[PDB]
Amino acid sequence: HRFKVYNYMSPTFCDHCGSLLWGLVKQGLKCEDCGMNVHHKCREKVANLC
Amino acid sequence: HRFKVYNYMSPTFCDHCGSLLWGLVKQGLKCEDCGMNVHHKCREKVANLC
Ligand SMILES: [Zn+2]
Ligand SMILES: [Zn+2]
Ligand SMILES: [Zn+2]
Ligand SMILES: [Zn+2]
After folding, report:
1. Ligand 4 being an ion, which residues bring their Cβ within 5 A of it?
2. What's the rounded Cα separation, in Å, for the pair B28 and B37?
3. Which terminus of chain A, N or C, has fewer Cβ atoms within 10 Å?
4. What is the distance in A from the centroid of ligand 3 to the CA of A23?
5. CATH of A1-50 given 3.40.1280.10, 3.30.1490.100, 3.30.60.20, 1.20.1290.10
6. Centroid of ligand 1 to alpha carbon of A38 (angstroms)
7. Contact between chains at B9 and A6 (C-beta distance less than 8 A)
């Protein structure tokens, strides 16, 4: 994965843990290649396989 | 048009005046129906026709 920080325009959940990516901006990280969305706290817990 | 404020993820120009929508977040307004992108200062100068 190549996670880049993303500003989400709709309530989006974290593809790793299932809770909402809270906030107005900078809510999480979106992988540039496959679109997985994760909380900053969950990026490290995701397998690299993309 | 139904302009809603948008957080752009790439350098985007204003479809009304041609200058860059400056900033990291809240750079401009995107029309929800046809995707036109405008600076907050240009929203009022755009014809309504969407
Ligand atoms: Zn990925
Ligand atoms: Zn999470
Ligand atoms: Zn429009
Ligand atoms: Zn403009």
Report:
1. B 14, 16-17, 39, 42
2. 7
3. C
4. 27
5. 3.30.60.20
6. 10
7. yes
List of residues 6+ apart from B44 with CB closer than 8 A: none
Documented resolution in Å? 2.0
What's the one-letter identity of residue B37?
N
Experimental method: X-ray
* Long-range contacts, stretch A40-44, CB < 8 angstroms, 24+ apart: A40/A5, A42/A14, A42/A16, A42/A17, A43/A3
Q: Indicate the residue of A6, A9, A26 with minimum beta-carbon distance to B6.
A: A9
